[PDB]
Write a protein that binds this ligand. Sequence first.
Ligand SMILES: [K+]
Ligand SMILES: [K+]
Ligand SMILES: [K+]
Ligand SMILES: [K+]
Ligand SMILES: [K+]
Ligand SMILES: [K+]
Ligand SMILES: [K+]
Ligand SMILES: [K+]
Ligand SMILES: [K+]
Ligand SMILES: [K+]
Ligand SMILES: [K+]
Ligand SMILES: [K+]
Ligand SMILES: [K+]
Ligand SMILES: [K+]
Ligand SMILES: [K+]
Ligand SMILES: [K+]
Ligand SMILES: [K+]
Ligand SMILES: [Mg+2]
Ligand SMILES: [Mg+2]
Ligand SMILES: [Mg+2]
Ligand SMILES: [Mg+2]
Ligand SMILES: [Mg+2]
Ligand SMILES: [Mg+2]
Ligand SMILES: [Mg+2]
Ligand SMILES: [Mg+2]
Ligand SMILES: [Mg+2]
Ligand SMILES: [Mg+2]
Ligand SMILES: [Mg+2]
Ligand SMILES: [Mg+2]
Ligand SMILES: [Mg+2]
Ligand SMILES: [Mg+2]
Ligand SMILES: [Mg+2]
Ligand SMILES: [Mg+2]
Ligand SMILES: [Mg+2]
Ligand SMILES: [Mg+2]
Ligand SMILES: [Mg+2]
Ligand SMILES: [Mg+2]
Ligand SMILES: [Mg+2]
Ligand SMILES: [Mg+2]
Ligand SMILES: [Mg+2]
Ligand SMILES: [Mg+2]
Ligand SMILES: [Mg+2]
Ligand SMILES: [Mg+2]
Ligand SMILES: [Mg+2]
Ligand SMILES: [Mg+2]
Ligand SMILES: [Mg+2]
Ligand SMILES: [Mg+2]
Ligand SMILES: [Mg+2]
Ligand SMILES: [Mg+2]
Ligand SMILES: [Mg+2]
Ligand SMILES: [Mg+2]
Ligand SMILES: [Mg+2]
Ligand SMILES: [Mg+2]
Ligand SMILES: [Mg+2]
Ligand SMILES: [Mg+2]
Ligand SMILES: [Mg+2]
Ligand SMILES: [Mg+2]
Ligand SMILES: [Mg+2]
Ligand SMILES: [Mg+2]
Ligand SMILES: [Mg+2]
Ligand SMILES: [Mg+2]
Ligand SMILES: [Mg+2]
Ligand SMILES: [Mg+2]
Ligand SMILES: [Mg+2]
Ligand SMILES: [Mg+2]
Ligand SMILES: [Mg+2]
Ligand SMILES: [Mg+2]
Ligand SMILES: [Mg+2]
Ligand SMILES: [Mg+2]
Ligand SMILES: [Mg+2]
Ligand SMILES: [Mg+2]
Ligand SMILES: [Mg+2]
Ligand SMILES: [Mg+2]
Ligand SMILES: [Mg+2]
Ligand SMILES: [Mg+2]
Ligand SMILES: [Mg+2]
Ligand SMILES: [Mg+2]
Ligand SMILES: [Mg+2]
Ligand SMILES: [Mg+2]
Ligand SMILES: [Mg+2]
Lengths: 45, 271, 93
Amino acid sequence: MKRTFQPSVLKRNRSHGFRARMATKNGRQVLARRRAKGRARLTVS
Amino acid sequence: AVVKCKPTSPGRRHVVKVVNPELHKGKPFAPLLEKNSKSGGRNNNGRITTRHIGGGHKQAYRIVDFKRNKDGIPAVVERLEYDPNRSANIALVLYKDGERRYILAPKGLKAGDQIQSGVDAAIKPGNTLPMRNIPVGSTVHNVEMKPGKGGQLARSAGTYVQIVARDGAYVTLRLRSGEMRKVEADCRATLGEVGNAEHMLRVLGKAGAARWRGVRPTVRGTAMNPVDHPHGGGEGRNFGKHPVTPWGVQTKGKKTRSNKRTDKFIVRRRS
Amino acid sequence: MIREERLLKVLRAPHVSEKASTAMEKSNTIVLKVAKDATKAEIKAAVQKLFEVEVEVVNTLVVKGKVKRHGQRIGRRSDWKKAYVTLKEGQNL
RNA sequence: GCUCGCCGGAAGACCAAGGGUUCCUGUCCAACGUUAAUCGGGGCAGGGUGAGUCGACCCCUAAGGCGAGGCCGAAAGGCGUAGUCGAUGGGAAACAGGUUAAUAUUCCUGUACUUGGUGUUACUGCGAAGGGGGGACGGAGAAGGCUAUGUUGGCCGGGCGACGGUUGUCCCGGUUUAAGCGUGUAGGCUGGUUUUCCAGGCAAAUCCGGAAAAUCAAGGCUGAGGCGUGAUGACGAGGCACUACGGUGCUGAAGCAACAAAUGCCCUGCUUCCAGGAAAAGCCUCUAAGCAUCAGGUAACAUCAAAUCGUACCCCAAACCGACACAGGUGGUCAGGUAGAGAAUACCAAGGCGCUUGAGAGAACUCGGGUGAAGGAACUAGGCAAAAUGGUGCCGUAACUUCGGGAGAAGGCACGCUGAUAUGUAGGUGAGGUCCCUCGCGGAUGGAGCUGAAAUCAGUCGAAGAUACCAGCUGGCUGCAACUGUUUAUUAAAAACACAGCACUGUGCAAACACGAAAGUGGACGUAUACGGUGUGACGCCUGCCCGGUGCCGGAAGGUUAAUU
RNA sequence: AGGACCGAACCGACUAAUGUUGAAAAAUUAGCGGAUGACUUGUGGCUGGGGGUGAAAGGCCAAUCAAACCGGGAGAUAGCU
Ligand SMILES: [K+]
Ligand SMILES: [K+]
Ligand SMILES: [K+]
Ligand SMILES: [K+]
Ligand SMILES: [K+]
Ligand SMILES: [K+]
Ligand SMILES: [K+]
Ligand SMILES: [K+]
Ligand SMILES: [K+]
Ligand SMILES: [K+]
Ligand SMILES: [K+]
Ligand SMILES: [K+]
Ligand SMILES: [K+]
Ligand SMILES: [K+]
Ligand SMILES: [K+]
Ligand SMILES: [K+]
Ligand SMILES: [K+]
Ligand SMILES: [Mg+2]
Ligand SMILES: [Mg+2]
Ligand SMILES: [Mg+2]
Ligand SMILES: [Mg+2]
Ligand SMILES: [Mg+2]
Ligand SMILES: [Mg+2]
Ligand SMILES: [Mg+2]
Ligand SMILES: [Mg+2]
Ligand SMILES: [Mg+2]
Ligand SMILES: [Mg+2]
Ligand SMILES: [Mg+2]
Ligand SMILES: [Mg+2]
Ligand SMILES: [Mg+2]
Ligand SMILES: [Mg+2]
Ligand SMILES: [Mg+2]
Ligand SMILES: [Mg+2]
Ligand SMILES: [Mg+2]
Ligand SMILES: [Mg+2]
Ligand SMILES: [Mg+2]
Ligand SMILES: [Mg+2]
Ligand SMILES: [Mg+2]
Ligand SMILES: [Mg+2]
Ligand SMILES: [Mg+2]
Ligand SMILES: [Mg+2]
Ligand SMILES: [Mg+2]
Ligand SMILES: [Mg+2]
Ligand SMILES: [Mg+2]
Ligand SMILES: [Mg+2]
Ligand SMILES: [Mg+2]
Ligand SMILES: [Mg+2]
Ligand SMILES: [Mg+2]
Ligand SMILES: [Mg+2]
Ligand SMILES: [Mg+2]
Ligand SMILES: [Mg+2]
Ligand SMILES: [Mg+2]
Ligand SMILES: [Mg+2]
Ligand SMILES: [Mg+2]
Ligand SMILES: [Mg+2]
Ligand SMILES: [Mg+2]
Ligand SMILES: [Mg+2]
Ligand SMILES: [Mg+2]
Ligand SMILES: [Mg+2]
Ligand SMILES: [Mg+2]
Ligand SMILES: [Mg+2]
Ligand SMILES: [Mg+2]
Ligand SMILES: [Mg+2]
Ligand SMILES: [Mg+2]
Ligand SMILES: [Mg+2]
Ligand SMILES: [Mg+2]
Ligand SMILES: [Mg+2]
Ligand SMILES: [Mg+2]
Ligand SMILES: [Mg+2]
Ligand SMILES: [Mg+2]
Ligand SMILES: [Mg+2]
Ligand SMILES: [Mg+2]
Ligand SMILES: [Mg+2]
Ligand SMILES: [Mg+2]
Ligand SMILES: [Mg+2]
Ligand SMILES: [Mg+2]
Ligand SMILES: [Mg+2]
Ligand SMILES: [Mg+2]
Ligand SMILES: [Mg+2]
Ligand SMILES: [Mg+2]
């Protein structure tokens, strides 16, 4: 059966990538939270 | 001509077609075409703002001359064409100077007929004049509401306006709605009625024919749940409320015009 | 024209393998490890200057580094650039 | 290694997406592998991805995104102009053969092609952010011409048979060759050329559009395939010689014709229909400012350049999505033989596999199947399930009907093989030969050869000839819904939803209405034969009485009545 | 010609049996419906939570839906166990 995750790198990057995060205040707050938590991987990029 | 399809299948039994042999079978005039991609009735917020719009055939936009302001230069009708963007047919016209334009095709207009616009044009179908220069009692179409703005009234297939009176700077028009409206006498109009009056005799015949025209299904309020529509709900077919729109406004008689700016121009409402 | 400083950094090592040995004997082609950012033009110039031979053509590829377990921890070797440098017929490097 | 079995419009082959070394070689067997494992997609190490032409990048745009100024908004922000991004679409160019353990249109061999830079010669109005052309477009259908491809013959090489026969009307195999360059054919489209003039193409124009004469009748554009060359080459059945028996080396005959033939190509065509079928650049052409014997343009010639990134491997799957080496899911391309209408189905080819526990036994019971005396729905909530019907041709076919239907109604007959008609017919294809020729890839003619149904008559085997696989059960009465559609992903597919049709009602355009503190946007580049809302639901015959209640519409005298004063 | 007919691919999901610590958190097998259209499918895009989208089932919005998910108010409150 067709499951929910149907990977596409283009859609992944456009939806959740670094530049998508940087494009809005709320996306930049995601990056701020993840840097503050000390995440090794900030985004899907 | 109005042609009834033979009932060779249940989707054909009720079809009534308007078949016009005068219309150009070839492609339209490419310099007067533009793309017009579809909306699905969605605005720039991406939200449906008009329900029941979607799909249907791809259509190119024909640039139609509603202004008719190329005055004093005769034009000859080259051919009548199907226009998917409107109920009326259009006419490709060639001016003496070599310019081509599209116009709304009036009743009776055929290839080879001569037309002209301006103050000194003849009172003949397809000629455009200021309504100051058109006799009272005349049948006109493509009527401007402001001078130079381009025709906005009586553009649909078979429609027309009657100039009932002339009073100083204004003319009184009887519109197809039955409304009596004042318009400035400097506003242009084209003599005659819009052609293709048989348009209203078509019978689509099947669901799919509406879908081809980009009309999506209407779901009745009473078929829904209360959460979706005021009419929703009931164990079985129930109603028991005054009919309303999906947004709760009475939909059987309640007047919705509210334009104090334009009230002065309305002599008599359609009633 | 490329500066000599640049040319002295583009060639990293000869690449030793069965395919490299066969390339030399059959097609007069030397196989080199080169700087990751080296272009075909830079490799050609560097080989002609430093090895004193005449180069016909340079073909290049990027070798992607292997992922490798050292104990438990996962690591990755570096990507590197390989150059197949075809010499003219009678050069004999 | 031999045999057996299974797939073969796939369980083969090549990819995109996704994955990321799983690829190849050596080595190891703890763990992983539902068992053992010497094996592995497992561990460890080493190797492996070669491009002017394939793809990305790049030029160009779609939906849409972002958006200098701008407009709007307590702030955050929203919208949007100029622009700038954005492929799933448009835009230059390479083929065949050979080669690695593992890449190859990338390496090698042979033979090509494209774009741009610089110079040399010649001739020469070049010049855009502008104009015009072009690019540039739908559905269905029909037929002709072809090719891929197949079959048969010829040719060449080999064979003479484990058991009766097999020197032939015998058996097996091969019979392949590209892009490019040249030629211009079946077919498709269109009348040419010249002169003069002009309110149009934001200005100009020699271009496009328009007008008027002159003149001639064949001019131009497009185009599959074929043919020639590419090719005195490459490939080649096999033979010979080695092997480190995995694989190499050596050498190599014929390499033709006829017939059949696509869903591929001519064809972005043609015919036809209504629901009326992207954009922008490259490209061609026109000039403006400008430069003006300079730059620039044009062609040939020479020379230089074409970077960078991807390229292994899986890819209907043990490598992707499903926690698994999971009976699931996953877009594109290729399309052999016999039978067949067929991409169904059966059996096969190329190729790929036997599904990572086996060995016995032959109880009940369960699962999946086969057959069944007599009976034949007695079963059961219900013929649930099963059994049955099933093909082609011809004959024949009721009520009712909206005249289409109902209908494949129902029901019935024929069907294999052999011979003859006819040593293979009707039809299709079409060589040599002959004839003509505004001269070719040409007609007129001719039927050699090839292919080839269908029918009739006669005979003949079986219980049975649509023999397997495959493949409608049929009829009668009635409720509901007109119909095709749609729906509760995962217990409901229906009488529910939708529907064409009908009606009421709103809406005069800065429309009503909707999204939005707003700007705006949709409605619509629509305009009352239009658009929104509501109910009803094809069609036929129709749709009665009630305005007291609640709503809506109109009224506006009188009563009552807010802020305010 | 056709929301025409029979029927593969393709799209569905009417019946039955199996399976129900499954081979599978919805399938398999035999049958079944549509199959030029109101068809189906690839890639990309847009609509956002009292919000969307809905040929309308309160259906669907990442195995979640009469108000998604994540974090926070937060140790909500719990005359109840
Ligand atoms: K409805
Ligand atoms: K109701
Ligand atoms: K909802
Ligand atoms: K109800
Ligand atoms: K109900
Ligand atoms: K074992
Ligand atoms: K390249
Ligand atoms: K690049
Ligand atoms: K024998
Ligand atoms: K080529
Ligand atoms: K050729
Ligand atoms: K490769
Ligand atoms: K792939
Ligand atoms: K019935
Ligand atoms: K159903
Ligand atoms: K009343
Ligand atoms: K909510
Ligand atoms: Mg509507
Ligand atoms: Mg129309
Ligand atoms: Mg329209
Ligand atoms: Mg309706
Ligand atoms: Mg309901
Ligand atoms: Mg309510
Ligand atoms: Mg009731
Ligand atoms: Mg009641
Ligand atoms: Mg090379
Ligand atoms: Mg490369
Ligand atoms: Mg590994
Ligand atoms: Mg391996
Ligand atoms: Mg084990
Ligand atoms: Mg052991
Ligand atoms: Mg391994
Ligand atoms: Mg290319
Ligand atoms: Mg845009
Ligand atoms: Mg914006
Ligand atoms: Mg700004
Ligand atoms: Mg761009
Ligand atoms: Mg693309
Ligand atoms: Mg390989
Ligand atoms: Mg078409
Ligand atoms: Mg052929
Ligand atoms: Mg012989
Ligand atoms: Mg014998
Ligand atoms: Mg033979
Ligand atoms: Mg087809
Ligand atoms: Mg590969
Ligand atoms: Mg297994
Ligand atoms: Mg699997
Ligand atoms: Mg599929
Ligand atoms: Mg076959
Ligand atoms: Mg099959
Ligand atoms: Mg048994
Ligand atoms: Mg049993
Ligand atoms: Mg049985
Ligand atoms: Mg019995
Ligand atoms: Mg018996
Ligand atoms: Mg019996
Ligand atoms: Mg009986
Ligand atoms: Mg009975
Ligand atoms: Mg009984
Ligand atoms: Mg009983
Ligand atoms: Mg049954
Ligand atoms: Mg059965
Ligand atoms: Mg009853
Ligand atoms: Mg129905
Ligand atoms: Mg149905
Ligand atoms: Mg369900
Ligand atoms: Mg169901
Ligand atoms: Mg507006
Ligand atoms: Mg109803
Ligand atoms: Mg049908
Ligand atoms: Mg469904
Ligand atoms: Mg099934
Ligand atoms: Mg049917
Ligand atoms: Mg069917
Ligand atoms: Mg309910
Ligand atoms: Mg869900
Ligand atoms: Mg709530
Ligand atoms: Mg609190
Ligand atoms: Mg608590």
